[PDB]
Amino acid sequence: MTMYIAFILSTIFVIGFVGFSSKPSPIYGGLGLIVSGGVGCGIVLNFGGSFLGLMVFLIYLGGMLVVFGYTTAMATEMYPEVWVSNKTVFGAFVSGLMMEFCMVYYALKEEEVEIIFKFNGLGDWVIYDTGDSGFFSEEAMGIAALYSYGTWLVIVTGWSLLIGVVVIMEITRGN
């Protein structure tokens, strides 16, 4: 209950992450990514990243749309699979849910998890910092400086994406 939505939102992020990582039918994989992508936008919004949160929302939605727009185009199965369907996907799925639910249980019952790195359960509200931001949002001014402080990044990103359209046609042209 509203203690801290960060863990709850990130949990749905992982459960949605478990989904398409279990190799469903590609269209159902898009749904599994989208829920994680949507709630992931929620996590960043809660942390103050208002622009970046909706940013990954808009781009990914368009990104994954052409993803499963493609799957029904030429990657569709004449009998599509589902979350239950084959025992392999069933096994791969339920493995993911039982896994993550084990770690969070391992997480929330001692608060001194030491897998790989250190993870202590005390509340992600704590790491926040006390201080104003004047009359500007910090994130918006940071990504705005791309056209003033990041002229080098603009060049390499712009050129790569322009080359990105060249390769896409060149690869897909053929013959």
Partner: protein, 98 residues
């Protein structure tokens, strides 16, 4: 290092595991590939926002710019392998065994 870091780090591991266990689909494989990108973008956003690394807030954006660029490459490659071999299961392209 609160539990939200655990959630997305452990998430990226399953994206790594999900990619490295191709079962029967290139398209579902590419899904796990773009899956990795969420956790990296989300973790990166949490880092430079928590630390107020304002000038580095562009890094998640540049990740996304080079993110979909790979995503386009994967599907474009997936176009021909499915076009000239019919489907996208990654088992029918073993003609390069010899």
């Amino acid at each position: 290092m609160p539990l939200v870091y655990m959630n997305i780090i452990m998430a990226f591991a399953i994206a790594l595991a999900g990619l490295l266990m191709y079962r029967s689909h290139l398209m579902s494989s590419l899904l796990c590939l773009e899956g990795m990108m969420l956790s990296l973008f989300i973790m990166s956003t949490l880092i430079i926002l928590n630390t107020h690394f304002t000038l580095a807030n562009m890094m998640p954006i540049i990740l996304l710019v080079f993110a979909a660029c790979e995503a386009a490459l994967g599907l474009s490659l997936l176009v021909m392998v499915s076009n000239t071999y019919g489907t996208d299961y990654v088992q029918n392209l073993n003609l390069l065994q010899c």
